[PDB]
């Protein structure tokens, strides 16, 4: 149930990190062009935190980014309510 | 119940502020290298606000940042719904 959510999130993350870096190479001055830092990017995104170190300059990138948000925000949001209830139900 | 949430949040905050500053020293040009400003950082984070003044450049830092989000977003989100219901239940 919830493990589904975490993984599903983790999946999306690995996907979007992969894709953005793939979508972003070839564009002179693209920042978002190695998986490690694509991964950080992908995280800061789905948390709706969004710090501005890193972002897609490419079009395809930004479409990666879109999918990442929709998918990620939800799949992350799932893990947040999971740890609230767990905190709630016990106490 | 809710006091649990506030503290638990405050805890995470003090933790992540501590850790990030610890994780971030030694890296030439790390910004996020004093508790005060680590604390501000940690706040702007768990609120999913995320302004871009400050962030971890280090790896370990970013892993601090991760824990901070997951923990913080939830523990903060708990205090938000607490003050909604309170606003709701009265009015």
């Amino acid at each position, epitope marked *: 149930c919830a493990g589904a959510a975490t993984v599903l999130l983790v999946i999306v993350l690995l996907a979007g990190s*992969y894709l953005a870096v793939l979508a972003e*190479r070839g564009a002179p*001055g*693209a920042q978002l062009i190695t*998986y490690p830092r694509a991964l950080w990017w992908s995280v800061v995104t789905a948390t709706t935190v969004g710090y501005g170190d890193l972002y897609p300059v490419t079009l395809w990138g930004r479409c990666v980014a879109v999918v990442v948000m929709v998918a990620g925000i939800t799949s992350f949001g799932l893990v947040t309510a999971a740890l609230a209830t767990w905190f709630v139900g016990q106490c | 119940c809710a006091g649990a949430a506030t503290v638990l949040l405050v805890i995470v905050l003090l933790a992540g502020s501590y850790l990030a500053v610890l994780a971030e020293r030694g890296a030439p040009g790390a910004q996020l290298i004093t508790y005060p400003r680590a604390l501000w950082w940690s706040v702007v984070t768990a609120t999913t606000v995320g302004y871009g003044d400050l962030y971890p450049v280090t790896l370990w830092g970013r892993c601090v940042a991760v824990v901070v989000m997951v923990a913080g977003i939830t523990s903060f989100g708990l205090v938000t719904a607490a003050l909604a219901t309170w606003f709701v239940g009265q009015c």
Partner: antibody, heavy 117, light 106 residues
Framework: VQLVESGGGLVQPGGSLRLSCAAS????????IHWVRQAPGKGLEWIGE????????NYADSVKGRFTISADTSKNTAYLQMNSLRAEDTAVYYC???????????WGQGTLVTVSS | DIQMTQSPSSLSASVGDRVTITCRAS??????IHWYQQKPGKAPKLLIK???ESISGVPSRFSGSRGTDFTLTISLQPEDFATYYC?????????FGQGTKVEIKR
């Protein structure tokens, strides 16, 4: 996990050659093979990169759309199709593995490509 | 594009001496710089990754540090006559420096 290169010697100015870089090693889903170049008594010049997985491969305005980079995943090899050669292109040509991280852990042996009439 | 300016081209330092090599990036490349030994005729051999981190097998004499000024430092041996190379990964595409010939003195 070594890298084995083949092809490359003499070509007519404006001619074409195809260079090879065989896997010969535990190679992952998502390694970029790159291509780096060394002119006689000169530094190095990043030229090209490729994921075999999706076959997308970016070049350098110095090799413009003059060269192409191919990825036969069955043979576990990536290639360097070489159109429109110039006397400048006279150089030695290394491929390299880069695991999406931004440095070159392994390298091909290097072959020489000579451009003259 | 991003310009790694290595300094200096040539070194005539005596063996056992301490030797350093400088890579001024045109802009902040973060910590995304890599050092490569390329011996006459052989292929490059990545000596340092991410500015300071070392690779399995590379001797303990080899270390890299730091602003936009990146350094590779030799505390020097006969096997070390090489050209040393410097590699950006902050922005697409990747870039090298001109490179530094060390030459041993005796």
């Amino acid at each position: 996990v070594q890298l084995v290169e083949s092809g490359g010697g003499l070509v007519q100015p404006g001619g074409s050659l195809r260079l090879s870089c065989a896997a010969s090693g535990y190679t992952f889903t998502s390694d970029w093979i790159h291509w780096v170049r060394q002119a006689p008594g000169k530094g190095l010049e990043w030229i090209g990169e490729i994921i075999p997985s999706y076959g997308r491969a970016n070049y350098a305005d110095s090799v413009k759309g003059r060269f192409t980079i191919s990825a036969d995943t069955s043979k576990n090899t990536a290639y360097l199709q070489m159109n429109s050669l110039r006397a400048e292109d006279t150089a030695v040509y290394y491929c390299a593995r880069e695991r999406g991280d931004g440095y070159f852990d392994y390298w091909g042996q290097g072959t020489l490509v000579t451009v003259s009439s | 594009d991003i310009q790694m300016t290595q300094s200096p081209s040539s070194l005539s330092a005596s063996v056992g001496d301490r030797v350093t090599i400088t890579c001024r990036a045109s802009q902040s490349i973060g910590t995304d710089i890599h050092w490569y030994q390329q011996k006459p005729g052989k292929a490059p051999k990545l000596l340092i990754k991410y500015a300071s981190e070392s690779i399995s097998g590379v001797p303990s004499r080899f270390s890299g540090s730091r602003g936009t000024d990146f350094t590779l430092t030799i505390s020097l041996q006969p096997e070390d006559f090489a050209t040393y190379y410097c590699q950006q990964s902050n922005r697409w595409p990747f870039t090298f420096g001109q490179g530094t010939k060390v030459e041993i003195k005796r």
